[PDB]
Amino acid sequence: FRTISNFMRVSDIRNKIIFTLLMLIVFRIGTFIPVPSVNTDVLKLQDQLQNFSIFAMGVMPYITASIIVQLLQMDVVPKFAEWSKQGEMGRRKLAQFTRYFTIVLGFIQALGMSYGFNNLAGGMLIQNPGIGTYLLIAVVLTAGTAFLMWLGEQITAKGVGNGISIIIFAGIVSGIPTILNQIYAQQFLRIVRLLLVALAVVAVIVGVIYIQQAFRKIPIQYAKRLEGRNPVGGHSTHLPLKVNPAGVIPVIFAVSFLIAPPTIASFFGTNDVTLWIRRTFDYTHPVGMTIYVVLIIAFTYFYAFVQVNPEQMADNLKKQGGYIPGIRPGKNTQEYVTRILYRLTLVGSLFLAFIAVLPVFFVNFANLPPSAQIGGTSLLIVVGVALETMKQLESQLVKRHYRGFIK
């Protein structure tokens, strides 16, 4: 195709995309190498009824550490409030504290994964279940996490785009070749059902891009024009608000807050109230499904009002610059944009709930393998990073040529 040919004729951009493909090669050979424990054959023979590697935890502690620091910017903390107030070196100090917090958080959660393996099965235990080889496993898992985030730091500077998001893309789409190898190993519904499934996948990708790439343009007008000097100028200044501002963070919240009550269900008592609360807090069946939907909606509202907070934005438009036509730049603009976010994050909430409940209500009506992942996080991450990378790359060909009036 001629777009890939246009990137083929530009040596610097094709050097950067070859750099990204080689860093994904580094990511792959980091995934294929085994762990120092001996239970790799055990998890191969069992199947635990996801996989396990040195990159098994992934960036998930760095995501939740970024969410922890962006929640403790809301309170009265003079330290982090002043680091956020400081423009550049407060941001770097904040990011380095976030790196320290995610490496200690991954270090304790790898120990938690070892303890959960011991409480799960007696085959995936180690020869010293209480003697500290778990610290060595935690150090090598956090070393893998540090290697992949340093890989992301390399590929966000020398490579194409958002370095964390490209390797998360790479990890999340690396299982669909196993799924498409499994689909005809289980197939033998002959084809009509498979073309209907492919049509529904293309239709839900059209739905997710039509919801995701949709902005609400509030036209802000800086006062710094002399209207008696020139004819009318800028319509090109506005405030873009998304339909779904939150992202996948509410879906990850609902995963966290519906897998946390199964620890209380992993009490040693295993009582009848334990089996009943485990039967109510599971979302493959409606009693957990409605809790999952309502908790997604609640935390979409919460994380919208965290990251696109109307009071901080209304103060940033009051201090340096200008206003919205008809609306005073104080608290009236904050009330106006709070109304706007009330009307947008409802649709973003319903969207995340619908797309996060598609896999359960999809594998039922298409009884084809239960490990297949389309929908929810599995769909939004791949589609958002995939088209954001091309929207980053196609902004160079417009830089390349200025075709004047003489030609």
């Binding site: 050979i29 669909i176 070749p177 990708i205 009307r343 649709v347 088209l387 990378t389």
Partner: protein
């Protein structure tokens, strides 16, 4: 009732969002299917290659 006129408010505000057009929609769909197919066949080729290489090194 707050619910009915609030629903009217939401359905009137959603007609002011800058939705993608049909041609940019199908451009985005084509490029996202191209990227997902390109990276899944790149990952299948590297699966086969690294599997043969770890067969070689045993």
């Amino acid at each position: 009732q707050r619910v009915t006129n609030f629903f009217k408010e939401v359905v009137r505000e959603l007609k002011k969002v800058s939705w993608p057009n049909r041609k940019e929609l199908v451009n985005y769909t084509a490029v996202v299917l191209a990227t997902v197919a390109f990276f899944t066949v790149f990952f299948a080729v590297i699966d086969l290659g690294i599997s043969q290489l770890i067969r070689l090194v045993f």
